[model samples]
Target: VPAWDSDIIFKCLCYFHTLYPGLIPLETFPPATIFNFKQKIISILEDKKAVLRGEPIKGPLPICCSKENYRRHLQRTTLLPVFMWYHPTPKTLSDTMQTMKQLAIKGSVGASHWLLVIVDIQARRLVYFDSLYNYVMPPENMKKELQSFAQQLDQVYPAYDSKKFSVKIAAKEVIQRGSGSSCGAWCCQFLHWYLKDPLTDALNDLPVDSVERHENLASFVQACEAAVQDLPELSWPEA
Candidate 1:
């Protein structure tokens, strides 16, 4: 029921040639696309925090980031969610666990057909959201992967032990796994929804319809254009 609207325009749009660069490869969301999405979230957080500081002027999302601050965010916060994009990389699975060691509260992946893993130590369970709902990436594979996660976490904080936390597959209506290449976009959207309110169950309500996907796809392209519109105009004379 979310209509991104012009509100998400900027956040959807720096916030986007910005992200638009990756749209050419949008069918398969480049790892950089997901990274850009994370920055979108971070910048939103950065802005709202600024708003609370009384800026009172809402304008463009120019995207200002400094490594020194992000590292501090990583270290200062005792518990924070970590977003990991898994694919086209050597240590995909391990890389997922890398941030968890810092006592992070959540882990996400838009991997393959696009899936999400939730380390709910609070509920004593590992949660998963496979957009296809176990079509191409079946439940057993998820168990094996999540089990591996539990095993990996045993070294850190009894990930699946201490009464053996359960592995759960989140229930949601989904498209056939054989559908379009928008799965990666769906993966990014899932985290975007989930992170919007980590306390709420968000995945089930998202529409898997092509209508929405078309809008989102166009939005990426539209927003990307916004960023590059101001670039110095190039010219070739002597026609």
Candidate 2:
């Protein structure tokens, strides 16, 4: 559901661009694009924490990063329930799990669907959320991939030790998304909403259609891109 808008930010960030930089947007939002929207959510939450607690915010701006900056960046986000990996794979988390408290992750099923999962390191559980439940309409591919990944974790040090994180599908509490490109928009909002009050279902308040979330996404991407031109580098170098 791409909004055709005069807001140049929406045009540039979410739609196809015709001008220079050759950075035209894609027909469907890509991981590269959605990744920053998630980053913006983290950046603002840290800013809010800084204002209330007077701790200066630090590190690369709250997106996924190289190992060098990961610990400091993760520490900075303690106010939030879980550290986030807006763009991470099931296997990529092997190194992170050793020290991480909890991790909220987004996984893509090609361009088909976006699935959200949270890892409870202490409880040894993996919770999965899907906007559209399966009845063979969409393959249970995300669960299979994560389930397989959980088995691999048994071999990783910290010794998952033949004890796999019990993979469980989250209750279908969210309103089923409108039948269209809504899965992406809804998944994008899920992370931000879940943090507001992690005790409750994230999409219980969302509507069947979400124009507001899409607009919010556009503005965040606009601010994120304009402030940091060139490529949206995802990391910092260790000295």
Candidate 3:
């Protein structure tokens, strides 16, 4: 990676820490802290042998603010606002509803906007969370976008019931949840519903000879790297 690439990853880490302060932890402060984290991530990347041949293999993934901005823009307009998870048991639907009801009774439901459940085919574990707290749209639009998003995500995440996730506002009061700080349950919705379809469609319409597989983990990692490469246009290095 270039010396500048390290700078980019540091910026991105800073952005995450700045945007969602409490969610992820770091020992260092600001830009310097980001550099430290990047060093560790670089170690992992080296271990995986994914580092570019002859490259120094230094630091974490870069900020690529332009890419991050584009991603954010894509998410804002196209991605569905929903949380997500994965599990093997077919009872995920019922279990999701039960969890919601329990949260409602316990006053945690009101703290969130809508609940979503995802049954992961790759990782057999239940994933659940609320979207309303993190999204910036109405319930109806959110729902529609979520449906579309889930379909697209199915191509990548490949959940069993890609179309079966549920959503609803709290029927009873519980507690209030803050924006951004709330669990990013809606992120999955955006990835699956809004961003995936359009992104894939754009790729399809391209004059390329063949389309790549989105469902594969390797493909996903490459996609993420490509995304980082585009972050400059997204107002990266938000210093």
Candidate 4:
């Protein structure tokens, strides 16, 4: 990880954008609109002519952890002090996870693998997410993985709520990532697997380029138009 003022610099801008009017002009904007806007920003920031290559926000591999552990880690690293220094109101674990999940998957242009873990700090036990779409899993293997990862986690954290944190592991690869040209609108049902709980609602409100929020809700309508009219389809360029 090349170090820069990413956290400070980027977050400052993000905070500025989020301060008053919010990112999207509309108050009732849905999740998909946010996702699409995120994509738009990626397109602009990652443009071929742009100087910066590696995006501060893009991580090829992200290891997910439980909420409690995540918070503890923040404190241990002294990063918590920064939050305290800023006097910023911290979001709840659920809200924090939702934000990270949304930012990671909404407009991302690669594949990701998520491993969510929840730990009980008091009991020092672990809970692992083993099934997709939160489906029920085979009790034996699920328990086994949970136990194994928990054992691994024990080596790192001595005391913490292992149950509170959910882990998601994402692996990014070069891929052709974007939405379609169809003016037809989309729903969270199509992309539920990509996000965690609660934040899934954000995808429903994605806004296409140019068209105001009041316009017909469509997935990547502006992106589709841009590709169709302004630019060519986006794909992974060769090294």
Candidate 5:
């Protein structure tokens, strides 16, 4: 069994953290040892595979909590204009509606998970995409959440009329994830591609397919593996 400190996933996360300290929150790191970490990753992968096949599984799997912790932090600090992700397609529409309602209610004052990759920017817009389906619409509850969130922001800012400060939903197109487990990888690829291009360009312009997306993901995992393998050589001497 490989040590968690020496695992490719850990190394990849560390590399990304070092590269973008602002984007990746370190506090969210799973409190687990190497063996436990491996187990957790395996479990998440299996759960995602089950979801893709439309089969039954245990309670919600914590595939990734980086966004969750970040949103929590923002909520704790009463920050405005926050951005975070949520799962658009949960097992039940009621659950989805409740989640969006909470996001709106909480976001009204300060803040807001899932792999569906929904990005809610208060007073601006809620952008979401499902790799499984090319076109997914924002539910009525989600639209109400945006409206309420915007209204709260307007009340505090007072720069615009709360009634007029409406928010829109942008359901963008994305390359489908051939497998459920690939959602995280696809998200990473999207971030990588988004950061490299001009901000004005639409995310849909990336032009990636399932094959290319997986290839990029494989390359990333390979690089992470190489980094982990070469850690000793890459390290510096202690002072």
Candidate 6:
């Protein structure tokens, strides 16, 4: 295992979170090792860069939990639906699937492992993409749970009638990750692409073959590396 493997993933997420603050919630975890200690050293360099360019330094900001910041951002939006991705330790397939189902019913659009799932509650459609197979529907259990959740929402919201709300699940093949380890990277890459285009356009434009898949993987890794490089060196404490 690489000492900096986790660092790479965290830095990539941080970069995306910075670029799309309202969409990609910031992660609360701190760096685990000294291998990429500089990744968190951002504001100082940003200030220094502004100073060298003869710009005024922004006032120092207090460090706070990223989750709190995300909550604040969410509060400001009225229509933006919830978006989440799970990168659980000791990953479990069942738990991840359950989480995806729960989020879908809450009107979320997200990716998990090799699956990119989106639930359009208003449209009553659930769509997902498999990295290897392109597109596929949720399992039987997931479909039933989603129906139950939607019915409950209908009862509480009143705008939706439980009898009229019918969820249609569909799937289609799009792109494939060449290797097992690349799924997470591809999930992040898909989110970046999805955010850049209209929903339908984004889904239609996903990489269709091996060439596109490799290109996306390469681009994702490059972006992560660039984010890591942007950080300043960290001062290590004496052991």
lDDT of 4 by residue, 39-115 (tens): 32223223311223322322111122333332223222210000100001223434533554554456441222222
Cα-based RMSD of the predictions, in order?
14.1, 13.8, 20.6, 18.7, 15.5, 14.0
Better of 1 and 6 by TM-score: 6
* Sliding window of 10 residues with minimal summed lDDT for model 5: 76-85
Please give each candidate's TM-score.
0.41, 0.38, 0.22, 0.22, 0.40, 0.47
Residue 25, model 4: Cα distance from true site in angstroms: 24
Task: Please list the residue runs of candidate 2 whose C-alpha ends up more than 4 Å from where it truly belongs after superposition.
Answer: 1-67, 71-111, 135-151, 154-164, 171-176, 203-239
Shift in Å, residue 17, candidate 3: 16
Considering summed lDDT, which 10 consecutive residues are worst modelled in model 4? 78-87
For candidate 6, give the lDDT.
Answer: 0.41
- Give the Cα error of residue 88 in candidate 6, in Å: 15
lDDT per residue, candidate 6, 216-237, as tens digits? 6777667667775864322111
Better of 4 and 6 by TM-score: 6
Sorted on lDDT, highest at the top, how do the candidates line up? 6, 1, 2, 5, 3, 4
Question: What tens-digit string does per-residue lDDT give for candidate 5 at 1-239?
Answer: 11112123334444544444333222122222211322332343344345445565443422344334433322322111111233444434445445556655555311112122222222232333334333333445556755665565444333333434454443344454454444434444444443343132444554367676567666755655665564433221111
Q: By the lDDT metric, which is better: model 1 or model 5?
A: 1
Question: How close to the true structure is residue 204 of candidate 6, measured as C-alpha lDDT?
Answer: 55
Query: Which stretches of candidate 4 lie above 4 Å from their native place?
Result: 1-73, 76-115, 119-125, 130-139, 160-239
Model 5 Cα displacement at 92 (Å)?
Answer: 9.2
RMSD of 6: 14.0
Clash count list over all predictions: 2, 0, 33, 36, 3, 4
**Which candidate ranks first by lDDT, i.e. highest?**
6
- The local distance difference test score of model 3 is 0.31
Clashing residue pairs, backbone N/CA/C < 3 A, model 1: 13-16, 16-19
Point to the candidate with the largest TM-score: 6
Off by over 4 Å in 5: 1-14, 24-129, 133-144, 150-171, 197-203, 206-209, 224-239
